[PDB]
Design an enzyme around this catalytic site. Sequence first.
Site, PDB file in Angstrom:
ATOM      1  N   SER A  94      12.974 -11.787  10.920  1.00 60.81           N
ATOM      2  CA  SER A  94      12.538 -10.726  11.822  1.00 60.81           C
ATOM      3  C   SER A  94      11.017 -10.750  11.983  1.00 60.81           C
ATOM      4  O   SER A  94      10.339  -9.750  11.757  1.00 60.81           O
ATOM      5  CB  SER A  94      12.987  -9.362  11.292  1.00 60.81           C
ATOM      6  N   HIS A 130     -16.400  -2.306   5.295  1.00 55.14           N
ATOM      7  CA  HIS A 130     -15.206  -2.195   4.463  1.00 55.14           C
ATOM      8  C   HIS A 130     -14.122  -3.099   5.011  1.00 55.14           C
ATOM      9  O   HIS A 130     -13.850  -3.124   6.213  1.00 55.14           O
ATOM     10  CB  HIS A 130     -14.668  -0.767   4.415  1.00 55.14           C
ATOM     11  N   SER A 132     -10.229  -4.337   3.900  1.00 53.53           N
ATOM     12  CA  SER A 132      -9.061  -4.276   3.036  1.00 53.53           C
ATOM     13  C   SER A 132      -7.853  -4.673   3.870  1.00 53.53           C
ATOM     14  O   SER A 132      -7.914  -4.650   5.099  1.00 53.53           O
ATOM     15  CB  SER A 132      -8.874  -2.857   2.488  1.00 53.53           C
ATOM     16  N   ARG A 135      -2.584  -3.116   1.790  1.00 52.65           N
ATOM     17  CA  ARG A 135      -1.362  -3.417   1.047  1.00 52.65           C
ATOM     18  C   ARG A 135      -1.253  -2.596  -0.224  1.00 52.65           C
ATOM     19  O   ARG A 135      -2.253  -2.322  -0.893  1.00 52.65           O
ATOM     20  CB  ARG A 135      -1.299  -4.903   0.682  1.00 52.65           C
ATOM     21  N   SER A 140      -2.292  -6.300  -2.735  1.00 48.90           N
ATOM     22  CA  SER A 140      -3.397  -5.522  -2.202  1.00 48.90           C
ATOM     23  C   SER A 140      -4.765  -6.170  -2.463  1.00 48.90           C
ATOM     24  O   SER A 140      -5.067  -6.588  -3.583  1.00 48.90           O
ATOM     25  CB  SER A 140      -3.364  -4.122  -2.805  1.00 48.90           C
ATOM     26  N   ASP A 172      -8.967  -5.052  -6.820  1.00 42.65           N
ATOM     27  CA  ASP A 172      -7.876  -5.803  -6.205  1.00 42.65           C
ATOM     28  C   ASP A 172      -8.201  -7.292  -6.208  1.00 42.65           C
ATOM     29  O   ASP A 172      -7.324  -8.129  -5.997  1.00 42.65           O
ATOM     30  CB  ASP A 172      -7.634  -5.362  -4.754  1.00 42.65           C
TER      31      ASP A 172
END
Length: 257
Positions: A94, A130, A132, A135, A140, A172
């Site tokens: 998918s 920033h 990111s 996640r 993450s 992270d």
Amino acid sequence: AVRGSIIANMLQEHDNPFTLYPYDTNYLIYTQTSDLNKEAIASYDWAENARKDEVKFQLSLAFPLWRGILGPNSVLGASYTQKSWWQLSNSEESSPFRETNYEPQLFLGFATDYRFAGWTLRDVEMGYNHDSNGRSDPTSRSWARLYTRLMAENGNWLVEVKPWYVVGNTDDNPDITKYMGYYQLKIGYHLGDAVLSAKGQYNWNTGYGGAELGLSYPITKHVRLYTQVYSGYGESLIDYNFNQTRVGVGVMLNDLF
Ligand SMILES: CCCCCCCCO[C@@H]1O[C@H](CO)[C@@H](O)[C@H](O)[C@H]1O
Ligand SMILES: CCCCCCCCO[C@@H]1O[C@H](CO)[C@@H](O)[C@H](O)[C@H]1O
Ligand SMILES: CCCCCCCCO[C@@H]1O[C@H](CO)[C@@H](O)[C@H](O)[C@H]1O
Ligand SMILES: CCCCCCCCO[C@@H]1O[C@H](CO)[C@@H](O)[C@H](O)[C@H]1O
Ligand SMILES: CCCCCCCCO[C@@H]1O[C@H](CO)[C@@H](O)[C@H](O)[C@H]1O
């Protein structure tokens, strides 16, 4: 002059509030990577069926929040940049999205006119960044930077440097600097309406880094055919410590200039 000059462009006022300003380049290309990092995304269902061919795209806009804040030709602005790796053709799964990197900024920018033996320093920009991938653990990734962006032109050439300093939480990905380094170099060359470009970072101490070569040509007034070849570490956050060579081909709106 005003060719690839972000800050000066933001200063030019638009009659329609819904007409945005470009910050970085905007493109959507069909790519094929040499290695699809599965270790990092193993938590995902589709992880196994992960294919080495993804639709990669980058969206990048700037928003003037306050012109003249620090004198004329100054602006307190914001930009939003997003790179996405999308397993579009991976139909059995998918068509999942493998990674998205959300990169908003807040800066104080200046449109300038300093001379450098032929060169003209056009942009001087200082801001908070920033980046990111939104996640939830374990996939993450996140880090933050205080940065300075400097762009100069000289004939068919454009050079932009972007040194930065890391601030905030890096848990992270605590060692991210080992792969990203302390700055980003970017070179554009105008050969008529063909635009060749290079964008990279390289930690001169750890030997890790990454590069991105590009070539574009106008399909029309607003859209270009774009070819990209990325190689090295840090293509996306989830692969910041993963090496790979990625070739892709697609369309582009604006290039660096
Ligand atoms: C501009 C052309 C690209 C169209 C892409 C369709 C919009 C799908 O949107 C994408 O959905 C993903 C699913 O979670 C999110 O992770 C991404 O952040 C989001 O950009
Ligand atoms: C480090 C702060 C960046 C400098 C941005 C402040 C904007 C000032 O602007 C600069 O002023 C100079 C006059 O000395 C002119 O020669 C330059 O053309 C002009 O861009
Ligand atoms: C050159 C100045 C650019 C203006 C940048 C906007 C910075 C606002 O950014 C702030 O920076 C702080 C760092 O001291 C962080 O602790 C905050 O989380 C962040 O929101
Ligand atoms: C305007 C010219 C500035 C270009 C930015 C390059 C600066 C990046 O320089 C880096 O600084 C780090 C901090 O000490 C050092 O640890 C690295 O060895 C060095 O490569
Ligand atoms: C970052 C993009 C890579 C830059 C490599 C492009 C090299 C441009 O090369 C230039 O080509 C011109 C026209 O042929 C010559 O006149 C110049 O002497 C030459 O320096």
